[PDB]
PDB file of N, CA and C in Angstrom:
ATOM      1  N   UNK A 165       0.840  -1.189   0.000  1.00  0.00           N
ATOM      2  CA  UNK A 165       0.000   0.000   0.000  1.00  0.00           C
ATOM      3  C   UNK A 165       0.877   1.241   0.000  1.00  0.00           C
ATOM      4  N   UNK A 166       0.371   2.387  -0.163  1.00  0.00           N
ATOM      5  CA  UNK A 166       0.863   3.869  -0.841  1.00  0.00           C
ATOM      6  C   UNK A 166       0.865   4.617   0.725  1.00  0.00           C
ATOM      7  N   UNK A 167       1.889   4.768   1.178  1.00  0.00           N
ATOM      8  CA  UNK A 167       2.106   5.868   2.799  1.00  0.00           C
ATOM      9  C   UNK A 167       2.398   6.836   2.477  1.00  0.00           C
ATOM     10  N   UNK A 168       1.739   7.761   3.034  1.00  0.00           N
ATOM     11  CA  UNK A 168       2.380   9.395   2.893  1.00  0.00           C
ATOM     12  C   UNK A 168       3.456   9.500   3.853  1.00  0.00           C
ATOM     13  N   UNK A 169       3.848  10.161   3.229  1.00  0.00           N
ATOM     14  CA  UNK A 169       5.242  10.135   4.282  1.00  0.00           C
ATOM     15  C   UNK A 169       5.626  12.303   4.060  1.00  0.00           C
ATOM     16  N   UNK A 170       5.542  12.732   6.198  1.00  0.00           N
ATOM     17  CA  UNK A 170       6.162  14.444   5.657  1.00  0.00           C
ATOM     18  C   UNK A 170       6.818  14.002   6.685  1.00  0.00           C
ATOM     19  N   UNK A 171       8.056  15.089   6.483  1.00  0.00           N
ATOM     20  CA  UNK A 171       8.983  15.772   7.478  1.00  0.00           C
ATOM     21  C   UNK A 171       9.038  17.155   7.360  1.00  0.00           C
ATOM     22  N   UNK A 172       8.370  17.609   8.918  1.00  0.00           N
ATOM     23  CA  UNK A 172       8.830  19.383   8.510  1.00  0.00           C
ATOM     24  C   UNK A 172       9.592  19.805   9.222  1.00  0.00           C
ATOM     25  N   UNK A 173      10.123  21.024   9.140  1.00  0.00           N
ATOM     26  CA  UNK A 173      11.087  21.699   9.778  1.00  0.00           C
ATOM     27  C   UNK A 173      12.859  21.030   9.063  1.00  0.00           C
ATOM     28  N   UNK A 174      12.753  20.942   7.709  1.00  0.00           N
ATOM     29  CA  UNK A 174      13.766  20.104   7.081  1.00  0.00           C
ATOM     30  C   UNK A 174      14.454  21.125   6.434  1.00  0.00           C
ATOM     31  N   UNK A 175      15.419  21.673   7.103  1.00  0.00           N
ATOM     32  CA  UNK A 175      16.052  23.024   6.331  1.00  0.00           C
ATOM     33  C   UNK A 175      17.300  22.117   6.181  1.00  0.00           C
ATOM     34  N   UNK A 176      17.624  22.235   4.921  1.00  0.00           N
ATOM     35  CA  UNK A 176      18.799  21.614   4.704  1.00  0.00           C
ATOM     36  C   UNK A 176      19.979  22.798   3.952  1.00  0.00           C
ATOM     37  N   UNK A 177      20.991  22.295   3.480  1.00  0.00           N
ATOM     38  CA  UNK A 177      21.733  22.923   2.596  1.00  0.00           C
ATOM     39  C   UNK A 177      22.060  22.140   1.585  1.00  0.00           C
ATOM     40  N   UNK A 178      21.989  22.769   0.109  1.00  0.00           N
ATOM     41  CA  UNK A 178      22.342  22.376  -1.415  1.00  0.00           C
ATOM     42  C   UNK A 178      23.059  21.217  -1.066  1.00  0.00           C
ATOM     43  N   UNK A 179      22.658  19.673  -1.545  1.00  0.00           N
ATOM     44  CA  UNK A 179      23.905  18.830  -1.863  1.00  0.00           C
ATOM     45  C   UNK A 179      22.881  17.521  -1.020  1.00  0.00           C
ATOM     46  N   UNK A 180      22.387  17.988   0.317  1.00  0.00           N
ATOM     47  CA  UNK A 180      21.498  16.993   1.542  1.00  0.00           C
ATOM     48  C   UNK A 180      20.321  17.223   1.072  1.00  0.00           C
ATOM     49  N   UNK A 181      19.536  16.089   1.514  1.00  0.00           N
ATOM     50  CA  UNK A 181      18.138  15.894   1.403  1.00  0.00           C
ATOM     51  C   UNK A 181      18.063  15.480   2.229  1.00  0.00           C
ATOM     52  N   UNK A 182      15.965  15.254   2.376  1.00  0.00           N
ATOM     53  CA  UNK A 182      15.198  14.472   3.472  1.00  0.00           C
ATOM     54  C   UNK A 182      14.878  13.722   3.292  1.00  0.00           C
ATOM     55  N   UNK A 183      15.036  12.381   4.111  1.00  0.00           N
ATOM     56  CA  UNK A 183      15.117  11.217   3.680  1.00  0.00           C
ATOM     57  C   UNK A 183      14.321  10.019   5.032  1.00  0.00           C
ATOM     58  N   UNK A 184      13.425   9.207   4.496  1.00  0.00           N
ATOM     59  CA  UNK A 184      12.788   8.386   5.605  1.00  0.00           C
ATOM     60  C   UNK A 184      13.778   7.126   5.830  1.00  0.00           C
ATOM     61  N   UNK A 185      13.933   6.830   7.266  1.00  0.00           N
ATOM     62  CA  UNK A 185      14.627   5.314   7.135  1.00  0.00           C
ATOM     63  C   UNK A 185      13.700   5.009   8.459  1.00  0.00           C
ATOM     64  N   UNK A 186      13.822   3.651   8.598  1.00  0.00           N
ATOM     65  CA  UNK A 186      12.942   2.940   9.474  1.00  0.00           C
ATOM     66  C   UNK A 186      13.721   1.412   9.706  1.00  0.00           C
ATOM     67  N   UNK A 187      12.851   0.681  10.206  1.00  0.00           N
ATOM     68  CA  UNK A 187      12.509  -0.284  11.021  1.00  0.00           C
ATOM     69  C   UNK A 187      12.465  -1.801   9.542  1.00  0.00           C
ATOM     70  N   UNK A 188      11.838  -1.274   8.763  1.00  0.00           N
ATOM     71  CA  UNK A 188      11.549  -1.970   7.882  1.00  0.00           C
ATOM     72  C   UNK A 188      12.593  -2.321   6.350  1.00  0.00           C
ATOM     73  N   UNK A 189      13.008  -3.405   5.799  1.00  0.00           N
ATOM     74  CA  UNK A 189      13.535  -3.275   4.532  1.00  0.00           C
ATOM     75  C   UNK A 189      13.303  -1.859   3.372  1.00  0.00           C
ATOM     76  N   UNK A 190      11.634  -1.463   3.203  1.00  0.00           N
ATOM     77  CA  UNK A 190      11.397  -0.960   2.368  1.00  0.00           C
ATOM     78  C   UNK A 190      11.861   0.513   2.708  1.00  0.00           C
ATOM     79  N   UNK A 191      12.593   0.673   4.500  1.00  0.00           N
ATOM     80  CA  UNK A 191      12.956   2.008   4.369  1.00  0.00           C
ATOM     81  C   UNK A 191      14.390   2.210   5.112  1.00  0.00           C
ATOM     82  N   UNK A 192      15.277   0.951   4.419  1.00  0.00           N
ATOM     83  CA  UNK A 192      16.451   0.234   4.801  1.00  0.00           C
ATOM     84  C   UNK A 192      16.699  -0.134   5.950  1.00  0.00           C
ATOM     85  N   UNK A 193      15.822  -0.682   7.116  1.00  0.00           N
ATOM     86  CA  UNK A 193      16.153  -0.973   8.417  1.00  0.00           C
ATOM     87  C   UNK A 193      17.198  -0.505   9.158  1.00  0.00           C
ATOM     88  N   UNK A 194      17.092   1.211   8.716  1.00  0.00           N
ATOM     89  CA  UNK A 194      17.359   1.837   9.785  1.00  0.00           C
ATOM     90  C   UNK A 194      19.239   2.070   8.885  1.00  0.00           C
ATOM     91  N   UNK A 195      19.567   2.063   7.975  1.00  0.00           N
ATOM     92  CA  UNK A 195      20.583   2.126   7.272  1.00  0.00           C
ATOM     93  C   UNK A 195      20.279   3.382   6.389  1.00  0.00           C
ATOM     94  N   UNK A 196      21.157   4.650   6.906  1.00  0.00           N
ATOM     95  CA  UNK A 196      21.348   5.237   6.209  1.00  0.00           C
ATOM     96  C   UNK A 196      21.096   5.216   4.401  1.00  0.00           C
ATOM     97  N   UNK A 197      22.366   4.635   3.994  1.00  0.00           N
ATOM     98  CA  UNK A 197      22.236   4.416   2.995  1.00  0.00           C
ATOM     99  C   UNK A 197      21.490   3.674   1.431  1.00  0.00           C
ATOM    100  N   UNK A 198      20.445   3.271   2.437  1.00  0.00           N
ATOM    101  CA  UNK A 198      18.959   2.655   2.200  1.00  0.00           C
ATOM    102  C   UNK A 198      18.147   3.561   2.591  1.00  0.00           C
ATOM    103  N   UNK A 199      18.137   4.593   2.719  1.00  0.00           N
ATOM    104  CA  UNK A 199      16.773   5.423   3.451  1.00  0.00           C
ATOM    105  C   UNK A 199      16.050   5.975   2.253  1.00  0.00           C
ATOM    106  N   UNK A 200      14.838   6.299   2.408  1.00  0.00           N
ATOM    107  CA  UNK A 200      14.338   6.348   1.451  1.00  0.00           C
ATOM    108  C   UNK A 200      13.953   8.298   0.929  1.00  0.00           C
ATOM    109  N   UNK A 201      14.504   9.057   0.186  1.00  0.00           N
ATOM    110  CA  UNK A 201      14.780  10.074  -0.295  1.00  0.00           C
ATOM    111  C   UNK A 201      13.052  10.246  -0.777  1.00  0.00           C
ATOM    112  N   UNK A 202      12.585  11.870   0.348  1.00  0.00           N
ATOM    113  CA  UNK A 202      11.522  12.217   0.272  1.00  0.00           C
ATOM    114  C   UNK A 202      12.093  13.556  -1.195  1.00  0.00           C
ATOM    115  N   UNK A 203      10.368  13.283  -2.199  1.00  0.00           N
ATOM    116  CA  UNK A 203      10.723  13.644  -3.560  1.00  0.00           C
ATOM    117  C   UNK A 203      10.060  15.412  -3.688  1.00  0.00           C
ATOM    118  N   UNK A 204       8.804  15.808  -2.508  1.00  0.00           N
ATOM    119  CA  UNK A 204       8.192  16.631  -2.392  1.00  0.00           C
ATOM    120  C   UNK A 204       8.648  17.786  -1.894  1.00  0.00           C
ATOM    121  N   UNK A 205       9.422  18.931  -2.439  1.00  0.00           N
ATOM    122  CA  UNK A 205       9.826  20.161  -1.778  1.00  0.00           C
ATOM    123  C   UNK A 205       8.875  21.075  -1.776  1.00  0.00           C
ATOM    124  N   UNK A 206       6.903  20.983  -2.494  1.00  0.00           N
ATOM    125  CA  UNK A 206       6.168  22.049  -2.945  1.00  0.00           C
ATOM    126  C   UNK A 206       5.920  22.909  -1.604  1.00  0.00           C
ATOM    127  N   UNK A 207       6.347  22.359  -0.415  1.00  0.00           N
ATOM    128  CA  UNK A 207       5.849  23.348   0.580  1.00  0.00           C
ATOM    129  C   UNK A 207       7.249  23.617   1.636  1.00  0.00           C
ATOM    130  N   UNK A 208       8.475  23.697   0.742  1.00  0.00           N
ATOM    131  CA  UNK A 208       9.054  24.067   1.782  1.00  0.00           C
ATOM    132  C   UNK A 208       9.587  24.457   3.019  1.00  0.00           C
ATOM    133  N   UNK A 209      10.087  24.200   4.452  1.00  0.00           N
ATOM    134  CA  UNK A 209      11.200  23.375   4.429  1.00  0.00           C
ATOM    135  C   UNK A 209      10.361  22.031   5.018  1.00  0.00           C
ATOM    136  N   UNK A 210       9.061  21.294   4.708  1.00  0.00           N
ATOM    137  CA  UNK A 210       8.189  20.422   4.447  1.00  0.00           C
ATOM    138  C   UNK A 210       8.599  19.656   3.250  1.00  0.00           C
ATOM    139  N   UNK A 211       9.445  17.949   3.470  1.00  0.00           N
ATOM    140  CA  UNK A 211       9.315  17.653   2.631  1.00  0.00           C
ATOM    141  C   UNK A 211       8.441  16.088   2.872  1.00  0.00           C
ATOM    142  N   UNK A 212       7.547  15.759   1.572  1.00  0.00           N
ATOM    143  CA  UNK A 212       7.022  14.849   1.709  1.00  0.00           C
ATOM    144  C   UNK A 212       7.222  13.873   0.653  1.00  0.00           C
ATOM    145  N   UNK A 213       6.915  12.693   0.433  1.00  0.00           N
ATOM    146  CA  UNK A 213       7.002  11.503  -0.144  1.00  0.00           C
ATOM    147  C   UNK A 213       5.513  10.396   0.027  1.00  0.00           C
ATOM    148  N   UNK A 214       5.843   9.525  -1.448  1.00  0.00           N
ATOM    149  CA  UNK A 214       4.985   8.582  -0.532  1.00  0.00           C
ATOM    150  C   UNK A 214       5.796   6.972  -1.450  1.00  0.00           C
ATOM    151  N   UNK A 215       5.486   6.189  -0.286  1.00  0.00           N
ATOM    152  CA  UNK A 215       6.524   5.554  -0.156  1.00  0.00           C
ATOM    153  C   UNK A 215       5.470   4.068  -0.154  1.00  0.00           C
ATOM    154  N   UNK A 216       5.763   2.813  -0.859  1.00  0.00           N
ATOM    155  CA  UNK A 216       5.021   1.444  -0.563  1.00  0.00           C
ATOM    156  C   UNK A 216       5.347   0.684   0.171  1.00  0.00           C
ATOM    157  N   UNK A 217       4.004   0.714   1.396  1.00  0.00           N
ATOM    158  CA  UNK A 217       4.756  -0.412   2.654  1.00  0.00           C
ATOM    159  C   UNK A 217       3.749  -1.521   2.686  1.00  0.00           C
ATOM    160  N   UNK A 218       4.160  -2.673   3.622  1.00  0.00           N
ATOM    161  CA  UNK A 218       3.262  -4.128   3.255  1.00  0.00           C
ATOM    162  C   UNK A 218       2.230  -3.585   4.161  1.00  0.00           C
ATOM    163  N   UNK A 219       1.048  -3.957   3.559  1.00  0.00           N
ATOM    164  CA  UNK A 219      -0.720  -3.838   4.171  1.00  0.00           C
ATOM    165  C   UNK A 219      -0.612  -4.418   5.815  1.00  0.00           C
ATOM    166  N   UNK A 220      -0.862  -3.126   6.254  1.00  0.00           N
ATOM    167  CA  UNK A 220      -0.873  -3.479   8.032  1.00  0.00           C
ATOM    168  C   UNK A 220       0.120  -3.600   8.697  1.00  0.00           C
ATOM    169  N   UNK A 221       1.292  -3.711   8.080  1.00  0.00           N
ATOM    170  CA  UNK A 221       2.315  -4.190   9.162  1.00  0.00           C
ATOM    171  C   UNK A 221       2.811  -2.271   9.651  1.00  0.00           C
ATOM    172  N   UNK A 222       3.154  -2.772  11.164  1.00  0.00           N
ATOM    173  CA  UNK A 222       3.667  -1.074  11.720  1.00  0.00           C
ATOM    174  C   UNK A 222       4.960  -0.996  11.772  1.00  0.00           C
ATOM    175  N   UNK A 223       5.289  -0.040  11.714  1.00  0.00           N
ATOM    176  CA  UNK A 223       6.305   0.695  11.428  1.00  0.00           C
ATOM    177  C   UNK A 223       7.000   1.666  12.027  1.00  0.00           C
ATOM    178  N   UNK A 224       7.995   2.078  11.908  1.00  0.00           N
ATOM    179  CA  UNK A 224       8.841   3.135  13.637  1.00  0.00           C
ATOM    180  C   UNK A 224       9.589   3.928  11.885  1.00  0.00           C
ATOM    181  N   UNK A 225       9.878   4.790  12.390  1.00  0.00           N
ATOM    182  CA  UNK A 225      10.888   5.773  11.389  1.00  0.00           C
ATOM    183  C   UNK A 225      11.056   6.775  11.677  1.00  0.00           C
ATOM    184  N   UNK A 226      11.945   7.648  11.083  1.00  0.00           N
ATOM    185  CA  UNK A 226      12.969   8.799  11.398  1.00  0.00           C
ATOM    186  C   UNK A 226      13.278   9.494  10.514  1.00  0.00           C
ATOM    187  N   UNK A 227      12.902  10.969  10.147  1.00  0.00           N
ATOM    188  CA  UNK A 227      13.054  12.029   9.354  1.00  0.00           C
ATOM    189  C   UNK A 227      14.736  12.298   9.272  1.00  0.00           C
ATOM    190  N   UNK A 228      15.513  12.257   8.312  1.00  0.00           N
ATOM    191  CA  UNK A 228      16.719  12.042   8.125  1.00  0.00           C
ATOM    192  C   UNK A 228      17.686  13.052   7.216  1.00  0.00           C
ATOM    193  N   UNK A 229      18.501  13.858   7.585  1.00  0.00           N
ATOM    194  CA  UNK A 229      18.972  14.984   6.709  1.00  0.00           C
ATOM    195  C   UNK A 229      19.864  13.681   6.521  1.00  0.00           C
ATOM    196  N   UNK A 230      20.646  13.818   4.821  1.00  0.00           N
ATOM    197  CA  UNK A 230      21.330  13.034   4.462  1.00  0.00           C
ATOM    198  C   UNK A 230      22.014  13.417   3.186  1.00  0.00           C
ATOM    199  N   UNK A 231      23.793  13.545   3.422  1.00  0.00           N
ATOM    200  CA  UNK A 231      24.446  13.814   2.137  1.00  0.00           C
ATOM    201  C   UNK A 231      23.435  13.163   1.014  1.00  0.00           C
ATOM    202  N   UNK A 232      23.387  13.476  -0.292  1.00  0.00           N
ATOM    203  CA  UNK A 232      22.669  12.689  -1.831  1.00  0.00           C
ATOM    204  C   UNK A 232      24.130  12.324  -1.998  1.00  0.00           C
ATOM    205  N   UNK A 233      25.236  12.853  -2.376  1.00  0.00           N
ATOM    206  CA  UNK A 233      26.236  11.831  -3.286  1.00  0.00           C
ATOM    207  C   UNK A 233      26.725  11.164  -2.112  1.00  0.00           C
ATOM    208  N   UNK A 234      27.499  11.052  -0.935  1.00  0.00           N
ATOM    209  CA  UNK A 234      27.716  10.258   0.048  1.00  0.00           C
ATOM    210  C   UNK A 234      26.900   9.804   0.571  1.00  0.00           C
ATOM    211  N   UNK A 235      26.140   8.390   0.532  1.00  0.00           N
ATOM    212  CA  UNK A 235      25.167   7.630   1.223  1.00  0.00           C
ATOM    213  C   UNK A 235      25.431   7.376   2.449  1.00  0.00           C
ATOM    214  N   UNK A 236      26.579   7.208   2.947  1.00  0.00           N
ATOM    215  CA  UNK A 236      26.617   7.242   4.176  1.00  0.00           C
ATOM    216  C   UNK A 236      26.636   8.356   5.428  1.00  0.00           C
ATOM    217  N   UNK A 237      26.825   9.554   4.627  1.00  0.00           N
ATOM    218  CA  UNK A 237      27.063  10.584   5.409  1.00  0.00           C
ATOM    219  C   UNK A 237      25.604  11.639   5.830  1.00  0.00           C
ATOM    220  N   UNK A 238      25.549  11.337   7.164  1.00  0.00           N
ATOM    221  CA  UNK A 238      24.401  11.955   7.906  1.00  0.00           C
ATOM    222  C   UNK A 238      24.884  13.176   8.325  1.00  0.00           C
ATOM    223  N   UNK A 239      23.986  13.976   8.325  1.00  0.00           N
ATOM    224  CA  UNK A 239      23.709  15.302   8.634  1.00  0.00           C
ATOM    225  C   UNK A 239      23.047  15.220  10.490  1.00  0.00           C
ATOM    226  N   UNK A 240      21.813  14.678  10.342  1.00  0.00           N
ATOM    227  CA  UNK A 240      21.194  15.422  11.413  1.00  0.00           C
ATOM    228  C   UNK A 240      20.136  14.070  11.541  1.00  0.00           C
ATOM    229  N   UNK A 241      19.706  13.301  12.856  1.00  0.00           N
ATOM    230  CA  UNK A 241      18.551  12.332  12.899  1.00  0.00           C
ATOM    231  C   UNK A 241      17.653  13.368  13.507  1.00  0.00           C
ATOM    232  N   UNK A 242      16.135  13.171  13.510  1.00  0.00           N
ATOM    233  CA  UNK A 242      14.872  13.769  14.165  1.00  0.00           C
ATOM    234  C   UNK A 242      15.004  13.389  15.555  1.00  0.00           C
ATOM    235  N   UNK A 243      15.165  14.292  16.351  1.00  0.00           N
ATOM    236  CA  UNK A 243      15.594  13.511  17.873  1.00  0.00           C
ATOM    237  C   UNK A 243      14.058  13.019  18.389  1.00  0.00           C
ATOM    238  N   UNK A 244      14.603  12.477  19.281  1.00  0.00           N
ATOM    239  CA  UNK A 244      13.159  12.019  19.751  1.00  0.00           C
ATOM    240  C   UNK A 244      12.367  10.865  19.495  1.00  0.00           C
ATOM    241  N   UNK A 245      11.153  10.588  20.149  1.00  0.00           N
ATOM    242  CA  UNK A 245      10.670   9.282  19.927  1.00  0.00           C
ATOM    243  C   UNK A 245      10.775   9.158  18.392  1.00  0.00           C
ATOM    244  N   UNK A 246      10.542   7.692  17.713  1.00  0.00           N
ATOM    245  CA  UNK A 246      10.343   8.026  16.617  1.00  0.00           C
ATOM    246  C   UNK A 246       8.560   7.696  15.674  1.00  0.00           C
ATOM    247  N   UNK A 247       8.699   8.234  15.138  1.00  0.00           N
ATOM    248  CA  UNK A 247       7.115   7.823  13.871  1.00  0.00           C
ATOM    249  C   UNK A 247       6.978   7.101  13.977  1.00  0.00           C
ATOM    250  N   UNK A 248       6.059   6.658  13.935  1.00  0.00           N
ATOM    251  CA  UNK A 248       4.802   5.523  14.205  1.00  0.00           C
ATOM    252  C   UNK A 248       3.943   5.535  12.872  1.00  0.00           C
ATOM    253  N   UNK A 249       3.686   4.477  12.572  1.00  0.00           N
ATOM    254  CA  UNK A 249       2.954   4.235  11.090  1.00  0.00           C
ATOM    255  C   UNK A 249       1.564   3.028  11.243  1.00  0.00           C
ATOM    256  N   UNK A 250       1.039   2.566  11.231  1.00  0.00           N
ATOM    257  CA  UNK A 250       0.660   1.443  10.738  1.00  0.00           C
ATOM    258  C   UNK A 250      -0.218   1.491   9.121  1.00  0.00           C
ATOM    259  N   UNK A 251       0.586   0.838   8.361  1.00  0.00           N
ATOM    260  CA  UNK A 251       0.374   1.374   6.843  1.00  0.00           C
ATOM    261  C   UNK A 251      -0.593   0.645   6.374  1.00  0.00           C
ATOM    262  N   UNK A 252      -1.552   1.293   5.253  1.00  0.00           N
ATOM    263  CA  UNK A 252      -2.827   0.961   5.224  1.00  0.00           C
ATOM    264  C   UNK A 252      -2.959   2.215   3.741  1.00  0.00           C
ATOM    265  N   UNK A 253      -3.854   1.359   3.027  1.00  0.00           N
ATOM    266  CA  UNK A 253      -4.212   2.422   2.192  1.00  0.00           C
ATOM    267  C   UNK A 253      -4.999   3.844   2.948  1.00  0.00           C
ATOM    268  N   UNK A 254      -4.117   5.002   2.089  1.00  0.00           N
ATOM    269  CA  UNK A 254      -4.320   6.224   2.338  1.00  0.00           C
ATOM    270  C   UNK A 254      -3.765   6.420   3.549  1.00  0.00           C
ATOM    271  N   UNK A 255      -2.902   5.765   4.633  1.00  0.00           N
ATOM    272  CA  UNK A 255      -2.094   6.098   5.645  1.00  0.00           C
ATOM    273  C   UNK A 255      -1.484   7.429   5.242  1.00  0.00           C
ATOM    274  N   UNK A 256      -0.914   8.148   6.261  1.00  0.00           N
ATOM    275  CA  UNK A 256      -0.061   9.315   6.646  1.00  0.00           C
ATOM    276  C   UNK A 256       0.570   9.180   8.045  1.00  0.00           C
ATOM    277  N   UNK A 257       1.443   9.709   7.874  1.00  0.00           N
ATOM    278  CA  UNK A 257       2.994  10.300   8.594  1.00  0.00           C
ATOM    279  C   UNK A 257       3.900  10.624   8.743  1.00  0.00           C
ATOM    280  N   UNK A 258       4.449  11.491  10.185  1.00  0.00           N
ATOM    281  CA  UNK A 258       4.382  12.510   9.826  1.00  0.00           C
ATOM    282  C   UNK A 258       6.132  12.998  10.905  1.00  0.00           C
ATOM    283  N   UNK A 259       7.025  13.641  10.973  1.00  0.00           N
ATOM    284  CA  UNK A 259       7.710  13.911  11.708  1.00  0.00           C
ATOM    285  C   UNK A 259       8.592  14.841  11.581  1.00  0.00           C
ATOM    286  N   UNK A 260       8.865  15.986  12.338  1.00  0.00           N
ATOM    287  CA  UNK A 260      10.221  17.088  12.347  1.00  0.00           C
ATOM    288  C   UNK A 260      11.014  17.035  12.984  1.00  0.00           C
ATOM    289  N   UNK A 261      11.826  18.105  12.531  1.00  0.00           N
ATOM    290  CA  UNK A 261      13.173  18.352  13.127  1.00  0.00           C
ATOM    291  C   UNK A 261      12.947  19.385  14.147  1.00  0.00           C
TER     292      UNK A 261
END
């Protein structure tokens, strides 16, 4: 199924993006370099995505500043508890910096 996925408060600088990683394969279990690169800048510094996760299963994740050409190189994690999902058609969620 189709998850919305925002992060706001995502001020980055030229070069980093916002990026979901989680708990799950589809949002590299928590591996940087598997995280999944949110595509939506229309509402600035709000970025959103939507992302396909398996029907029902829940989910934990983390709004993620993240070099684009160095995959491994992190910027900044969303402190704090993390997102909570349980994905479902038309799901949303949601987390800042």
């Amino acid at each position: 199924v189709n998850v919305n996925f925002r992060c706001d408060n995502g001020v980055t600088q030229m070069g980093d993006s916002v990026y979901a990683v989680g708990n799950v394969s589809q949002l590299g279990n928590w591996s940087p370099a598997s995280a999944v690169r949110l595509t939506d800048t229309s509402s600035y510094p709000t970025w959103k995505g939507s992302i396909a996760l398996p029907d029902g299963q829940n989910v934990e994740w983390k709004c993620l500043i993240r070099n684009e050409a160095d995959a491994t190189l992190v910027r900044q994690w969303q402190s704090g508890g993390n997102n909570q999902v349980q994905a479902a058609a038309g799901a949303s969620t949601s987390g800042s910096f």
